[PDB]
Design an enzyme around this catalytic site. Structure first.
Site, short mmCIF file in Angstrom:
data_model
loop_
_atom_site.label_atom_id
_atom_site.label_comp_id
_atom_site.label_asym_id
_atom_site.label_seq_id
_atom_site.Cartn_x
_atom_site.Cartn_y
_atom_site.Cartn_z
CD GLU A 1 -3.08 0.29 -0.19
OE1 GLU A 1 -3.25 -1.28 -0.03
OE2 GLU A 1 -4.31 0.76 -0.15
CG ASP B 1 -2.85 8.92 6.46
OD1 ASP B 1 -2.67 7.91 6.72
OD2 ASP B 1 -2.55 8.66 5.84
CE1 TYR C 1 -7.58 -0.52 6.74
CE2 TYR C 1 -6.56 -0.48 4.54
CZ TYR C 1 -7.01 -0.44 6.33
OH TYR C 1 -5.88 0.14 7.37
O1 F9F Z 1 -1.12 0.81 10.23
P1 F9F Z 1 -1.18 2.09 10.80
O2 F9F Z 1 -2.03 2.33 11.93
O3 F9F Z 1 -0.27 3.07 10.44
O4 F9F Z 1 -2.18 1.93 8.96
C1 F9F Z 1 -1.91 1.53 8.23
C2 F9F Z 1 -3.40 2.59 7.24
N1 F9F Z 1 -2.77 2.56 5.63
S1 F9F Z 1 -3.17 2.95 4.44
O5 F9F Z 1 -2.21 2.87 2.83
O6 F9F Z 1 -4.09 0.59 4.93
C3 F9F Z 1 -4.82 3.24 4.93
C4 F9F Z 1 -6.01 3.52 4.70
C5 F9F Z 1 -7.65 3.37 5.09
C6 F9F Z 1 -7.34 4.88 5.82
O7 F9F Z 1 -8.60 5.81 6.08
C7 F9F Z 1 -9.44 5.25 5.44
F1 F9F Z 1 -10.28 4.11 5.95
F2 F9F Z 1 -10.46 6.09 6.26
F3 F9F Z 1 -9.81 5.27 3.96
C8 F9F Z 1 -5.95 5.69 5.21
C9 F9F Z 1 -4.89 5.04 5.23
#
Ligand code: F9F
Ligand code: F9F
Ligand code: PLP
Ligand code: PLP
Ligand code: TRP
Ligand code: TRP
Ligand code: TRP
Ligand code: TRP
Ligand code: CL
Ligand code: CL
Ligand code: CL
Ligand code: CL
Ligand code: CL
Ligand code: CL
Ligand code: CL
Ligand code: CL
Ligand code: CL
Ligand code: CL
Ligand code: CL
Ligand code: CL
Ligand code: CL
Ligand code: CL
Ligand code: CL
Ligand code: CL
Ligand code: CL
Ligand code: CL
Ligand code: CL
Ligand code: CL
Ligand code: CL
Ligand code: CL
Ligand code: CL
Ligand code: CL
Ligand code: CL
Ligand code: CL
Ligand code: CL
Ligand code: CL
Ligand code: CL
Ligand code: CL
Ligand code: CL
Ligand code: CL
Ligand code: CL
Ligand code: CL
Ligand code: CL
Ligand code: CL
Ligand code: CL
Ligand code: CL
Ligand code: CL
Ligand code: CL
Ligand code: CL
Ligand code: CL
Ligand code: CL
Ligand code: CL
Ligand code: CL
Ligand code: CL
Ligand code: CS
Ligand code: CS
Ligand code: CS
Ligand code: CS
Ligand code: CS
Ligand code: CS
Lengths: 267, 395, 395, 267
Positions: free
Chosen positions: A48, A59, A174
């Site tokens: 990703e 984030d 997801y």
């Molecule tokens: O391990 P962490 O807690 O840093 O999470 C990893 C996240 N990286 S990601 O690209 O999957 C990702 C996936 C979804 C996100 O927001 C959403 F749910 F609103 F869509 C943000 C980042």
């Protein structure tokens, strides 16, 4: 197709997927490319990859700071797409998913965005600030360009949402660990096996658990609950942040971490 | 699925992470319910009258228009408790928070006025208030930060991104994403994801409703135009809403032109930006060529934001409302004019609206026209900024 | 010879140089005439409503009195244009100046609020305004000085005597002594020579008149007491006047106790001074043993004056009104309390009145009592002073 | 009696009175006593003497500054009364009038004030901020203690005021040159001979013109218009102010000025 192939192969090996997140161009283009090759060599099953954006409102601070580091290095979306083309040119089969925010996708036209993703060999796009209610033009453009639209299944999903995400999604679903924003500092606090089971009933794309995954036991837990694997972002990015002064130690620690996390996916 | 249309034409929507959709749905339902609830309406009216001081005066400004065929009234939101129109909607949002059983408030602020209004409503109504403010804004708005803290609010500097208002907006939503079961996000303008543009309009519409009654009483007819500055859109839509169906009445919105449109140093996205998706909405914004959200600029902090509420973009597109810009220097001149000719010190924000009215009058001094400017705030907060500019000029 | 009694009992009179007696006689006649003139009254009402924003709210303060048998309302003069009650009487005095055919205004100011109110009325009504201000006050009130100048008033530092408010009062009369054919002296409180205590009371009496109507409407009875701070006496007599014949209603005036009565560093002449003759009146004042006018003190500049209006001294002597003091620290506590519990930032002046009400409540929390505090001004002007004290304390 | 005797003697010599004003104790007690003796030796016919007061609201800047100088020297009313006793002990017949403000007279009791004036040998008291309308307790106490109450006749006096001032006053009637406050910078601009004539008709105390008199021609003008003489304050005080650094030059210039002003009273 890359996701379908990966999940079938992992299924045959009774393995979960381990999927790291990094910000493209953090802390610079060259080191970022080395970071990503290290993640793969150490056992990442898919990636990703975030395009630096001014307003990453899903984030937490770790990934806010990754975005800022990429900007300090002058990284632009165009440069990110050059990077993605090169990544795919190096690695034929690994699934590459982008983490986008809506304005970057909309900016030069939604269709043209997904056309560029197709041209460089991206496999999926998750647009963090587009909920299923607003998803129609994004998911349509994705599918026209052979890109999997990634939908979020929150812990508090009702039946209608489960059915929508199952129906419209491709690649993977997801599976959000918890409310809030990305970060290793907050661990998910809810069992998700019921959602995982319902997603399977509705023939959804395989589930990857994401948010707050920072430890081998969480990877194994995801697999044990029936998910196809787990995504880890902030934990990976923290290693970058910690080791900015030593690229060699950075890569060493990234390797050890990814290796351990991938080992945990055996199950 | 929603009760109300989240869009005004092509503009608006609900561009938030999936996690927040239940928060928006809950808020929309609670609003629709409240709008049908006589008890809610009575409580809101009671706060507006006995605490905030409604109705506000409509002042005829005879000195400033002498020797022209313009008649100019000012709607005196500067007299509202708090010294700006923001107090109206924060009271209504605080009541919605209570309606939903929440005891905590989250708010963003740039200039600090919304932070102050959020804190005062929270103090009165017994809600815990936390306010996000870009660290650069915290540095430049010590007086307002202190006011928020006196009223018992927590003020949290935001150091991410550009450390200014957009970054505070992001942080507020980040917090809400993880706290909405117990906390309400008291968004500070008629922008962001549905249902905020709708709620903020409805909780500000008394401005235009009163103006209409007051102008009919005093002049026996509706105004030829009503004029308001546009920062995110709340004071303007509050003045406009009750006149939308009165199609003889001009609706004029004034964006900040900063150093001049041509310089790129302005805050006028509706007319000089580019549609994008940010802060939960599809709307005109100021952005880089590759779609990063840009730095806005105005002499007035209240106006300094790179986007605009979706109903304004819609009213513009259909030609129901007209949008113009006023530069820093034009605003400053209007500020000085009002002080000297009417004994009213206007907010630099409001000075943009007045500046456009003065231009309408001066350009065509023999045109009969009945204008209302929404004087959305007082300008005590601005006298240091003005002092420092006038000094540099050696005035 | 006068139309009206210049004295309230033994207090008051017309202790001016002979040269000024025609000026006072003219003013008294013009006032008596104006009070019978429907046109004057209509013009005054029009300014008060449409320009100043009357009527002002009466706010019930439920958080601050929870768990006691006190019901507390605040009369919201802080919401008046200008942010203090002074605006009411400057409008009326400006109309009297016009009535007499004068086109120039002279005013004294200490804290600067009266200077601002004089300048705004003058700007609106087309009068030239010159304001005298002790040089020490000019130095410490840069914001207000700038506000006066924005509104086109001339501000003239006074370097004689102690270079503070009493010295400005002297200078204003010196100027008037030589200019009264063309200029009106817009005295800033209900003190000085007759007819000013009378005029200022009558031009502030709407405060108490509205309060009486509002309390009857809301509570169905008159208040047990109305409470106002006393700097020179204007806001207090404005709240009191309409209740004087309602002998069940307590009238409580609060003088500044400064560092404490016993320290001598206060501004409480009515109860702790000595009757003298100064500024055109026989009244209690703070003075040296040999009769030099003394330096007053309060944390609040608005209260810092060594005398008091004659009607207060009279109402005290006959026992119709009771006068008390509140120290700097008590005022500061009340300031902080109102901000946190009601979301209202009060003038440090008004904080003295609120502090006494809080003491009435706290001392006897089971006593049923319906109180009104005259919240004569807002406290935005005070946040620097408060900040600096709290910082020194390490709060 | 001292005024009555003076005016009779001046009448016999066809002379006007020249009457300087100074602030007692300006610039200090000792120099003030020397100043006053110089004024007398140079030809002053009577004196007007101010007690330093915090709020002299009938005085322009010159005399404001004289008050401030006396305060800087620590001069108090008690010390002023010691000075007055000594002045009278030196000079038996010269009329001594005080310029007071009401609070100093009221402070320890009106009656006691005038009793102290009588004890030290003062002849008149002018209370600058007490108009005839408020004069009753002051004029009564004055007369009980053989002190002349001095009333002001403004340029704009009506008939009733002329009659009151004529009736209640003793010693001299103060004939104001103009509106405003004391000062040599502003000269009177109105002929006063009509008021002078009316005062004589009503058997008023003899008129002394005061305010803005700074030149010999003004003294002669006062006499020519029918006044009994003229008072000069700011012009005298300016000489003090100018010469603070040289007491010797100060006294020289005071002598020359008073001598010239007194010379002008011949007529
Ligand atoms: O391990 P962490 O807690 O840093 O999470 C990893 C996240 N990286 S990601 O690209 O999957 C990702 C996936 C979804 C996100 O927001 C959403 F749910 F609103 F869509 C943000 C980042
Ligand atoms: O020569 P100038 O212009 O300084 O005038 C001299 C004045 N000295 S004085 O004691 O006669 C004097 C007399 C009257 C005064 O005020 C009053 F008229 F209101 F009573 C003030 C001073
Ligand atoms: C907050 C503010 C604005 C700008 O915000 P809007 O939501 O556009 O009204 C303008 N004027 C004043 C006085 C304000 O306080
Ligand atoms: C001016 C002022 C005072 C003191 O003057 P008063 O004539 O005694 O009323 C008190 N409170 C406020 C808010 C003021 O502005
Ligand atoms: N407190 C946990 C579980 C939870 C409670 N309510 C929620 C609503 C949505 C998602 C998760 C939750 C979290 O925030 O994750
Ligand atoms: N910056 C102003 C107005 C404001 C609040 N929130 C906003 C959001 C968008 C645009 C403007 C605003 C304030 O904080 O008082
Ligand atoms: N010092 C305050 C109030 C004031 C004006 N004039 C006064 C006279 C006496 C006592 C107080 C006052 C101000 O100037 O705003
Ligand atoms: N201008 C002159 C004459 C004058 C006009 N009107 C007055 C009223 C009173 C006394 C004097 C005057 C002065 O001030 O003295
Ligand atoms: Cl390895
Ligand atoms: Cl590259
Ligand atoms: Cl692109
Ligand atoms: Cl859909
Ligand atoms: Cl479906
Ligand atoms: Cl979080
Ligand atoms: Cl969380
Ligand atoms: Cl579940
Ligand atoms: Cl398994
Ligand atoms: Cl549209
Ligand atoms: Cl649409
Ligand atoms: Cl409604
Ligand atoms: Cl309704
Ligand atoms: Cl500031
Ligand atoms: Cl501060
Ligand atoms: Cl605080
Ligand atoms: Cl940072
Ligand atoms: Cl209606
Ligand atoms: Cl009409
Ligand atoms: Cl742009
Ligand atoms: Cl581009
Ligand atoms: Cl329309
Ligand atoms: Cl232009
Ligand atoms: Cl009495
Ligand atoms: Cl009396
Ligand atoms: Cl009346
Ligand atoms: Cl009436
Ligand atoms: Cl200050
Ligand atoms: Cl300033
Ligand atoms: Cl100016
Ligand atoms: Cl000086
Ligand atoms: Cl009635
Ligand atoms: Cl009732
Ligand atoms: Cl005292
Ligand atoms: Cl004494
Ligand atoms: Cl009574
Ligand atoms: Cl005490
Ligand atoms: Cl000689
Ligand atoms: Cl001596
Ligand atoms: Cl004495
Ligand atoms: Cl009498
Ligand atoms: Cl008589
Ligand atoms: Cl003068
Ligand atoms: Cl003059
Ligand atoms: Cl004459
Ligand atoms: Cl002769
Ligand atoms: Cs699917
Ligand atoms: Cs006009
Ligand atoms: Cs804007
Ligand atoms: Cs109570
Ligand atoms: Cs006082
Ligand atoms: Cs006489």
């Amino acid at each position: 197709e890359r996701y379908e192939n990966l999940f079938a192969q992992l299924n045959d090996r009774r393995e979960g997927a381990f999927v790291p997140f990094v910000t493209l161009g953090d802390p610079g283009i060259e080191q970022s490319l080395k970071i990503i090759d290290t993640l793969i060599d150490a056992g990442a099953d898919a990636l990703e990859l975030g395009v630096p954006f001014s307003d990453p409102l899903a984030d937490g601070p770790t990934i806010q700071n990754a975005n800022l580091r990429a900007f300090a290095a002058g990284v632009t979306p165009a440069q990110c797409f050059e990077m993605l083309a090169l990544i795919r040119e190096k690695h034929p089969t690994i699934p590459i998913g982008l983490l986008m925010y809506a304005n970057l996708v909309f900016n030069n036209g939604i269709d043209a965005f997904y056309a560029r993703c197709e041209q460089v060999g991206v496999d999926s796009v998750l647009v963090a600030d587009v909920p299923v209610e607003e998803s129609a033009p994004f998911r349509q453009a994705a599918l026209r360009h052979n890109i999997a639209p990634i939908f979020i299944c929150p812990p508090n999903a009702d039946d209608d949402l489960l059915r929508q995400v199952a129906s419209y999604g491709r690649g993977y679903t997801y599976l959000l660990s918890r409310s809030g924003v990305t970060g290793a500092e907050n661990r998910g606090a809810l069992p998700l096996h019921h959602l995982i089971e319902k997603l399977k009933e509705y023939h959804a794309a395989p589930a990857l658990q994401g948010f707050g995954i920072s430890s081998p036991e969480q990877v194994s837990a995801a697999v044990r609950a029936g998910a196809a694997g787990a995504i880890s972002g902030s934990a990976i990015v923290k290693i970058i942040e910690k080791n900015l002064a030593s690229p060699k130690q950075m890569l060493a620690e990234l390797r050890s971490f990814v290796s351990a996390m991938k080992a945990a996916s055996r199950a | 699925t929603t009760l109300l249309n989240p869009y005004f034409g092509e503009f608006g929507g609900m561009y938030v992470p999936q996690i927040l959709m239940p928060a928006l749905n809950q808020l929309e339902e609670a609003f629709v319910s409240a709008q049908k609830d006589p008890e809610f309406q009575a409580q809101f009216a009671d706060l507006l009258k006995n605490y905030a001081g409604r109705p506000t005066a409509l002042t005829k400004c005879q000195n400033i228009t002498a020797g022209t065929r313009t008649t100019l009234y000012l709607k005196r939101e500067d007299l509202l408790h708090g010294g700006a129109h923001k107090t109206n909607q924060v009271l209504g949002q605080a009541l919605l928070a209570k309606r939903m059983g929440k005891s905590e408030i989250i708010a963003e602020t740039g200039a600090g006025q919304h932070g102050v209004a959020s804190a005062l409503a929270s103090a009165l109504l017994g809600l815990k208030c936390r306010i996000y403010m870009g660290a650069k804004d915290v540095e430049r708005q010590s007086p307002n930060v202190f006011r928020m803290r006196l009223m018992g609010a927590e003020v949290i500097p935001v150091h991410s991104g550009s450390a200014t208002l957009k970054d505070a907006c992001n942080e507020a939503l980040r917090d809400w994403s993880g706290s909405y079961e117990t906390a309400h996000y008291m968004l500070g303008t008629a922008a962001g994801p549905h249902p905020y543009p709708t709620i903020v309009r409805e909780f500000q519409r008394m401005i235009g409703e009163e103006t209409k009654a007051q102008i009919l009483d005093k002049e026996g007819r509706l105004p030829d135009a009503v004029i308001a500055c546009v920062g995110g859109g709340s004071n303007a839509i509050g003045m406009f809403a009750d006149f939308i169906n009165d199609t003889s009445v001009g609706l004029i919105g004034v964006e900040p032109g900063g150093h001049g449109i041509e310089t790129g140093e302005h805050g006028a996205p509706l007319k000089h930006g580019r549609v994008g998706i940010y802060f939960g909405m599809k709307a005109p914004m100021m952005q880089t060529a590759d779609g990063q959200i840009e730095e806005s600029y105005s002499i007035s902090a209240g106006l300094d934001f790179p986007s605009v509420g979706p109903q304004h973009a819609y009213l513009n597109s259909i030609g129901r409302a007209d949008y113009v810009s006023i530069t820093d220097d034009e605003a400053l001149e209007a500020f000085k004019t009002l002080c000297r000719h009417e004994g009213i010190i206007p907010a630099l924000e409001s000075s943009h609206a007045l500046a456009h009215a003065l231009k309408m009058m001066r350009e065509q001094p023999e045109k009969e026209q009945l204008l209302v400017v929404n004087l959305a705030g007082r300008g005590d907060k601005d006298i240091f900024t003005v002092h420092d500019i006038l000094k540099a000029r050696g005035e």
